[PDB]
Design a protein around this ligand. Sequence first.
Ligand SMILES: O=C1Cc2cc(-c3ccnc4[nH]ccc34)ccc2CCN1c1ccccc1
Ligand SMILES: O=C1Cc2cc(-c3ccnc4[nH]ccc34)ccc2CCN1c1ccccc1
Lengths: 388, 373
Amino acid sequence: AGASRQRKLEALIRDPRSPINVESLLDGLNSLVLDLDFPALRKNKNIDNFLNRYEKIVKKIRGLQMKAEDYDVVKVIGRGAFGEVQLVRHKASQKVYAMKLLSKFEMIKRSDSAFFWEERDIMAFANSPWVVQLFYAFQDDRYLYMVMEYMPGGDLVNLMSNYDVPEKWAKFYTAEVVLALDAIHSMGLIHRDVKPDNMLLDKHGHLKLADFGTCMKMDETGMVHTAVGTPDYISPEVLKSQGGDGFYGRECDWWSVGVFLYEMLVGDTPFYADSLVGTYSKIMDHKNSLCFPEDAEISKHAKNLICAFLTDREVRLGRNGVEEIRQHPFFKNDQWHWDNIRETAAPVVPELSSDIDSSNFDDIVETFPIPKAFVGNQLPFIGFTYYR
Amino acid sequence: ASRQRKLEALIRDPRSPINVESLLDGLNSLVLDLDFPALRKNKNIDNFLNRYEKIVKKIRGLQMKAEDYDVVKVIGRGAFGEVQLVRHKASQKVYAMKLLSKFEMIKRSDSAFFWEERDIMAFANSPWVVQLFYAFQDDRYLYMVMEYMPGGDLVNLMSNYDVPEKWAKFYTAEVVLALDAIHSMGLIHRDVKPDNMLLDKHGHLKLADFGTCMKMDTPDYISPEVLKSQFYGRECDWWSVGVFLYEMLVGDTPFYADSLVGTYSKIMDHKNSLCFPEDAEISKHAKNLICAFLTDREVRLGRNGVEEIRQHPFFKNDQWHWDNIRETAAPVVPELSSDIDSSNFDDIEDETFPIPKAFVGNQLPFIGFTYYR
Ligand SMILES: O=C1Cc2cc(-c3ccnc4[nH]ccc34)ccc2CCN1c1ccccc1
Ligand SMILES: O=C1Cc2cc(-c3ccnc4[nH]ccc34)ccc2CCN1c1ccccc1
């Protein structure tokens, strides 16, 4: 039926996961007008007349759609790959959010301009208390923006520097990391950058993972095909794949949990060295180079858990699913079960003096040229806008 | 939230340039204008096309297209295209479908005439205007799917009947109301002639070919003010009604001539050159009405609205009033053998854009054309 073809078509456009939803279609139109509205290109009558037709309505859309001017920048709370995270207050609602900015220019120039799709999608659609929630994604000519729930507790780096961390606490945060990662892994995704910087504490001292900009979608075999920042938390299979064309899967996140628990209990990274090259070399030689210092206050079970994660991938814990991790005797405790850990009293419940208190965080351009012909610099970002 | 309410309201509106169909045209037209092997040397373009290849192909398959309609016969030809009698395959319903060449319009068309043509037929909601059911497009052509008018045109009627005054009264009155409806929408036809007056299944009139409409703020039927301008208003349509009525009652055009230059010269000399031949038996009122339309623009009947036209004694009759004319028995009731009978229409006899090196945007002037009822 002709009516059924129109039913099907409407169903694609109503779906919030769809590439041709209304927001994506509006990005389509906006991005086209941005890419065309340059006096040189307007020598083409097709382009000139089209812009004259859509001048009014695009100005009208631009005004109504969500934009940077809707938010007051309170403070920059972190810097990263293609931009920054700023603590913001939405002007009209007076509600506080974390807002991550990514430079379009820098992404085009450094050629790393599709990681943001999975970063957006996971935060938008996880519906998991272990994943930072995305409320809005929007864009202007210069930047992509992700408005996310603010995590006033700070990161595990900050926690480790302020508390000598007892094993009982280490057990708690590790357990939350495990469930967090299992939730991500059950969505078919690998984090690939599990480190204390990206483990954030909410207003009640409970963990969520953040920075989903190195997320890859796993294939039907559990594997993924790109770059890396700092090496301390990266698994040895990930290091060999960068030079070669090797594969790796979810086990690379489980390595990092081993590294995390060593950091927490010992106070240092297991493969610490002064240079990056030193660290890289120690990680490749993990069979020899892993060594618990004789002064470290650590249980036999905690050593056994760290040692089970810090092996070659083929014998590593977390290949055969999360259940073998959960049953490890290290995790035996009086305080929580796996089904309820996140609804128990956290070790450190942050004490905050206002809704913009960022005291658990440490204190802290160039554009496209006016092009001679059509280049389509906005085309990679059509579909980014998301209004929940 | 109020800003999101307002924005959604613009998108729901079928008159809006950013309705869903227009937004889909936006996406389709962008993909057509970009998807060329040369342009895909740009990674921005290549990657964008890779993201939207599948879903656009899927949309194209779902959306209405030429292959949905079976072409029965070409029933007319014109400026940048043609009108074909078609049957929609799935519904089995018969329609008149106008095609317009995108290439030829880009090449030779100085104005985007199709917008007003589409809008009038889409949104008039008048029994005097041909209704548009669907408008759609492919890479080569715009398509307007309209109600089929099986009764033929008034040219066809005049060639097959001696038209008595009682009939002329009826058709002229229907032309009047038709034009009044157009004029009430803020539009001038600029091409009122019997070729563009069509008869429905019941022998009642509607106007057609709204491709020369301008929004207000062949030479036989052209008014003298239109000739000298190469500004003007609605009275140029009313001239042509005068010409129409003379043609029906006499059997010849009032300013007929051998050349075009002769016709043009006779039209400019309408004060002298208008002359009722002594063997044609015309009434005093019919002469009075023809003479009232065929004047200089400033004193022409229809300047001060439709009302002076309606009260003219010519239109006094026993068969119909102005409020019910379209509900009365037409003079010539079409005798049709089927839903594709085109026997009241004469038979008819019988290039693309180059593959560009860089972006030209040949599909951009047609974003927004799609309309689904
Ligand atoms: O994405 C991140 C992780 C992150 C998260 C937060 C944060 C703090 C409190 N609540 C929050 N809610 C959501 C994020 C968040 C603050 C700083 C960083 C630093 C690095 N980084 C990054 C990566 C690439 C470009 C720019 C920045
Ligand atoms: O638009 C028209 C008017 C028209 C209408 C019909 C017709 C016949 C029966 N039912 C109908 N319903 C709607 C139109 C219609 C048949 C032929 C012509 C010839 C000229 N022409 C034109 C002008 C420019 C380009 C292409 C064509």
